[PDB]
């Protein structure tokens, strides 16, 4: 899902 | 049909491969891949390869998700650059649904609905030219790029020179060899900074190009010990990187684009497509310029544009005319970045073109006149409106046209915007040294 | 009048000072100064010194401007850091045009202005206490600063300890020493945070102590090989640094905040005060917090306000009312950082509160429910209201409040406007470190 | 009028 | 126009 941040 | 099961069989047979990279492009435009030997080409080649297809959703993925491989066979190409223990070949692929209908989250299966839409319409192709430029960064002792360029050169200087080094020479001649349509390749205004042009293909052509040609660029300038980038604005004070496409759209007739008889030598269509291209542009802006980076370049005194207009001959236009006519009629739109996925900026563009063209809306005059000259209240009160300054109002001004969300599909533009948000977030929350070398001494 | 002329004659002769700093602030918030020697003391008392008043506009200045510095006396600090060759003191001045009439952008003069109005509605003084913060980081070997904190403290940990270092201590006992009066001091949530309280004085005065206090901290940490900083955001992903102003409003009865029969035990003044600092807090964003390091502040989970509301017990309210009552009766605003011009800050709270109080609104209710338990869209359906996330957007909001223009003075809103509008275009075009390490591979 | 630039 | 300067 939000490996981003 | 340039090749059969059988030929591709028998190119695999005589060129001693033993390894083929099934590949395709996601939604942040990344190019993602699945390596299988050679003994299963025939399988590949049954459409019987199954996949994770919430890969092409990126980062934002959440749920496995099973997708076949439908792979394309004019797309077969050998990699030079494999030594002797088997050769290495890819073919670009089309992503589908186990019920036998293609993935609506492909990229590419959304160029092709796209120009099944304009062939209804009544069009053949559409033709585009893009025009890539690329920063070359010599490498540290780890092989980590630096911050240095490789050589101080100028706008079609013949800077790198004969006798070794120009890697531009090399990169155009390994292109070619490995069957690539190179029309042109100069040094553009930057330092260290290289355009290459292509030739004129279909739209699904010019997108695998694109991304081979990123490909293989990469992978030429790290074997001479450099770094090969495509980000919009790597350094600051200096000229960005763009893609400028050149677009024409074909009739049974020929270039539906020209006409002898009208004003410009355009035709009506033309037009249409202007007045679409420039109406959506606020729109698709986010689309053809994706990264956070991409909104550094578009700033005024480094030729890239600014303002929503068109013109023939002017000072960093958003769209422009070139000068030749017959076949090579074409359109360019100068704000596409080398960061964008070409699929999509495709997919918008011709969309917008094809809502102009049934609506048969009317472009505004062109303008030149220096509109840098006037200040922005001096230029509001005509057409000419600005570009969103950072990704965020471009995000915003996606979520408000719809045209573009058509264009984009339910699936992409959910994806796409999620992504993109997270994008923003991050950067927004983040502390850069700027900050710690404004305020840090001074408050 | 706590100080004549006499008395300042009488204190440079006994306590043997050579050199005088006439200071003011800026609209930016840096105090400036200009040097005299003692001899020149008389002519300073008599309100003749002349000097360059665009200084005050800061870096935007453009055509040179004669004005006065007319000096407070009450403001004579002696400085006990000047060795035996002579002591330094200084006196806070207000700066006045060549026709005896005050400058309309002095901050300290607005600041009186408002303070005038305030006094022609009906009320005696506004008292205010601040509770700024500060980071303490190591000098490097070149007394440069680094990013390493000082110590690895927690919320009111007993961290520094004895035997030595204890740089805040040291800190609270000069300040003592010098004349501050200092209500408590202790360590804050993040490692290498501090705070320190101040009591409860007048609006002037409690700015100029603002002032003083951010040298005295600054020179003092330069003492002991440490580098303060007022910066809100110096680190990322670490609590931020505050500059809550706990503001009451005084009549000639007493505090005008305080109604034992009313609800809260607060007054009607003290809800139509709080209706106007919730109705304009858009508005005096860009004051309160004008770095673009503020809005990295102004994030979630940090403790830093981020909606528009107010309460007595919640996560993170813009306002708060804190629960003592009687004299101490009060308003805490949240919302502003130590980067912040005390003046300006100060006048359009002021201006704000007292626009409240004369259209006589009726606040919102109180929540009390974790407004960040819901989504934007489920909250912005009440009256929960998203504070800017940018320094362009507060600009835009300034740009179309009136009664923050009206608290500010023409001179001083067009310089103040000009000043981070130019801030805001410099940090937009440039390239950081961020998008390097996010795009330079990958693109 | 502008250092900081 | 003038990248010289
Ligand atoms: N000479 C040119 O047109 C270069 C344009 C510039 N490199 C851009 O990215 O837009
Ligand atoms: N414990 C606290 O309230 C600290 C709050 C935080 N340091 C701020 O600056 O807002
Ligand atoms: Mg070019
Ligand atoms: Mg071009
Ligand atoms: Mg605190
Ligand atoms: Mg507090």
């Known amino acids: ?5 | 049909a340039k090749y059969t099961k059988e030929d591709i069989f028998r190119f695999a047979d005589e060129q001693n491969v033993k390894f083929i990279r099934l590949q395709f492009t996601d939604i942040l435009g990344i190019i993602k891949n699945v390596e299988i030997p050679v003994s299963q080409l025939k399988k590949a080649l049954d459409n019987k390869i199954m996949f994770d297809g919430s890969s092409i959703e990126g980062f934002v993925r959440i749920e496995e998700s099973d997708m076949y491989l439908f792979p394309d066979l004019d797309t077969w190409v050998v990699f030079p650059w494999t030594a002797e223990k088997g050769k290495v070949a890819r073919m670009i692929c089309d992503i589908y649904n186990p019920d036998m209908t293609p993935f609506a989250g492909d990229p590419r299966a959304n160029l092709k609905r796209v120009l099944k839409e304009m062939e209804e319409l009544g069009f053949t192709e559409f033709n585009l030219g893009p025009e890539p430029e690329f920063f070359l960064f010599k490498l540290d002792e780890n092989r980590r790029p630096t911050l240095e360029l490789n050589d101080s050169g100028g706008y079609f200087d013949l800077a790198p020179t004969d006798l070794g080094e120009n890697c531009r020479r090399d990169i155009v001649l390994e292109l070619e060899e490995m069957g690539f349509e190179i029309e042109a390749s100069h040094h553009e205004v930057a330092p260290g900074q290289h355009e290459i042009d292509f030739k004129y293909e279909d739209a699904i052509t010019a997108c695998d190009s694109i991304q081979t040609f990123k490909l293989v660029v990469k992978t030429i300038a790290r074997k001479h010990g450099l770094h090969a980038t495509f980000m919009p604005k790597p350094l600051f004070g200096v000229n960005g990187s763009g893609m400028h496409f050149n677009m024409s759209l074909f009739n049974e007739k020929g270039n539906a684009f020209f006409d002898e008889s009208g004003e410009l030598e355009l035709s009506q269509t033309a037009y249409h497509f202007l007045a679409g291209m420039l109406k959506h542009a606020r729109g698709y802006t986010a689309v053809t310029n994706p990264t956070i980076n991409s909104f550094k370049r578009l700033v005024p005194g480094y030729e890239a544009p600014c303002y929503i207009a068109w013109s023939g001959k002017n000072r960093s236009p958003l769209v422009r005319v070139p000068s030749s006519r017959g076949l090579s009629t074409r359109l360019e739109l100068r704000s596409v970045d080398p960061s964008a996925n070409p699929y999509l900026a495709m997919a918008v563009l011709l969309k917008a073109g094809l809502s102009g063209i049934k609506d048969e809306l009317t472009p505004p005059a062109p303008v030149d006149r220096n509109i840098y000259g006037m200040n922005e209240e001096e230029r509001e009160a005509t057409g000419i409106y600005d570009l969103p300054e950072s990704l965020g109002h471009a995000l915003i001004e996606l979520e408000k046209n719809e045209i573009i969300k058509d264009g984009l599909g339910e699936h992409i533009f959910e994806h796409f915007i999620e992504a993109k948000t997270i994008e923003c977030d991050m950067f927004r929350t983040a502390v850069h040294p700027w900050e710690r070398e404004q305020y840090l001494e001074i408050y």
């Not at chain 1, 899902?1 to 941040?5: A, H, V």
């Open chain 1, 1 to 5: 899902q939000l490996p981003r941040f």
